[PDB]
């Protein structure tokens, strides 16, 4: 168990558990769940309506002081009724800690823009909108950031195909670059790698 | 001197000229009281183009509201008369 196994830290685990309990007690209106991962990573699941309060409390509270937003992104899980999972990562320099705040939304429900709380979010929320199609309410200048001008659809969504729907080429008759339906000389070859034998008993799900 | 004392007859003549200048409307068929949607079979989008043509013709901004009701030429004449204060 010594040489090749990653060592544990129970002190940080206890501190993060206590602080998660602290946050949950202070904001019962929005906090739905609190988790401490095995490698000491605090996670706080909330209600979407509490995006702005929670973050504000987390960045302003004397005992919190998470004044820096590492990054903000989204995860697509099609099996969930609320497709998109919004993940905020925050860093506290005063207490040398990190915290993760997660909420959910679907295709037609906006999330409150948090540019007011953190200036850094601007481009992160633009990127989430571009890649996933999640609208952010009250956003200063919301528009595509990564994709091409006039590009239809959101690439990061699970349903979207890897190579998309159109390609580009230069056409001499019209003397310009044109977009046409994708044709591939060699199709991407899909591999089935998943082993039919279970790897991790600790994560086994009930047999329904 | 500035612009002449515009009258209702001038407004009606200009409005009907604009309508007869629209491709999707046969000229001699349209009347002053012909409803745009019912009489000429025009869609909501078509009405929007006609109102914008009025704004170009008479040079004043007709909001989205108060344009949703100008559904026959006569209502356009009444609206312009009200906005420009013309009675005779």
């Amino acid at each position: 168990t010594r040489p090749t196994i990653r060592p544990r830290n129970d002190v940080v685990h206890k501190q993060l558990s206590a602080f998660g309990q602290y946050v949950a007690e202070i904001l019962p209106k929005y906090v739905q769940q609190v988790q401490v991962s095995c490698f000491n990573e605090l996670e706080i699941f909330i209600h979407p309506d509490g995006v702005i309060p929670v973050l504000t409390f987390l960045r302003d509270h004397t005992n919190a002081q998470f004044k820096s937003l590492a990054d903000l992104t989204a995860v697509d899980v099609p099996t969930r009724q609320n497709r998109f999972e919004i993940v905020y990562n925050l860093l506290s320099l005063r207490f040398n800690s990190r915290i993760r705040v997660k909420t959910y939304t679907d295709e037609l429900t906006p999330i409150e823009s948090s540019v007011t709380v953190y200036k850094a979010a601007n481009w992160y929320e633009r990127e989430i909108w571009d890649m996933f199609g999640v609208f952010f309410a009250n956003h200063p200048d919301l528009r595509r950031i990564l994709t091409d001008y006039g590009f239809e659809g959101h690439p990061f969504r699970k349903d979207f195909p890897l190579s998309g729907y159109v390609e580009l080429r230069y056409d001499d008759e019209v003397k310009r670059v044109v977009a046409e339906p994708v044709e591939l000389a060699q199709e991407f070859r899909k591999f089935d790698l998943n082993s039919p034998w279970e790897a991790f008993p600790a994560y086994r799900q009930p047999p329904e | 001197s500035d612009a002449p004392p515009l009258t209702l007859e001038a407004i009606k003549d200009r409005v009907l000229y604009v309508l007869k200048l629209y491709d999707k409307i046969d000229p001699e068929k349209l009347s002053v009281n012909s409803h745009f949607m019912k009489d000429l079979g025009l869609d909501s989008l078509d009405q929007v183009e006609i109102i914008m043509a009025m704004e170009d013709e008479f040079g004043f901004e007709i909001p989205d509201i108060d344009a949703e009701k100008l559904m026959c030429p006569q209502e356009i004449v009444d609206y312009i008369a009200d906005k420009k204060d013309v009675y005779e």
Partner: protein, 176 residues
């Protein structure tokens, strides 16, 4: 544990003021920079006489791909397709069948050199040292089609570069 890069205060004695005035009016630090460039003018340049002189390389160098043989002249590749499975760019295409003598050999072995990222994962994955990245790097073509390698081209590369490839492998296989 930290240090300051711009927290120094200048002395205000008459000598220091006169030295700074001389620096301002007579441009001393500019002459210092001129002296540095003049010093570099009289050094030997670090340029090499290419193509006559070459840059140093290593036995681990990753270059053009090649298919190798056993000393008997039999091909090493047995069509396990591990290189095709591991390739992150999907640059390898393999088709195989039993040979006329029942041997497990490939009938198609293509590498798309304009897909390849030259990572060397395939030669790590190969269990019989059949596919290698040889030492060559001067194989620019005039057309795109010349960079779509089939089995004949790769076997020819192996035949052409075996003498150096074997010597490179002998010098590095004990680190692998």
């Amino acid at each position: 544990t930290y240090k300051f890069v711009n927290m120094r205060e200048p002395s205000m004695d008459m000598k220091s003021v006169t030295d700074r005035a001389a620096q301002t009016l007579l441009w001393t630090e500019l002459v210092r920079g001129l002296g540095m460039t003049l010093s570099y003018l009289f050094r030997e340049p670090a340029t090499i006489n290419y193509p006559f002189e070459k840059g140093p390389l290593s036995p681990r160098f990753r270059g053009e791909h090649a298919l190798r043989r056993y000393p008997s002249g039999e091909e090493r590749c047995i069509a396990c397709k591990l290189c095709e499975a591991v390739c992150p760019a999907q640059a390898i295409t393999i088709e195989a069948e039993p040979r006329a003598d029942g041997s497990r050999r490939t009938t198609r072995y293509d590498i798309d050199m304009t897909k390849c990222i030259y990572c060397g994962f395939c030669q790590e994955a190969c269990p019989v040292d059949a596919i290698v990245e040889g030492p060559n790097f001067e194989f620019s073509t005039e057309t795109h089609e010349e960079l779509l390698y089939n089995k004949e081209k790769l076997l020819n590369n192996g035949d052409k570069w075996e003498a150096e490839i074997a010597a490179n492998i002998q010098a590095d296989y004990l680190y692998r």
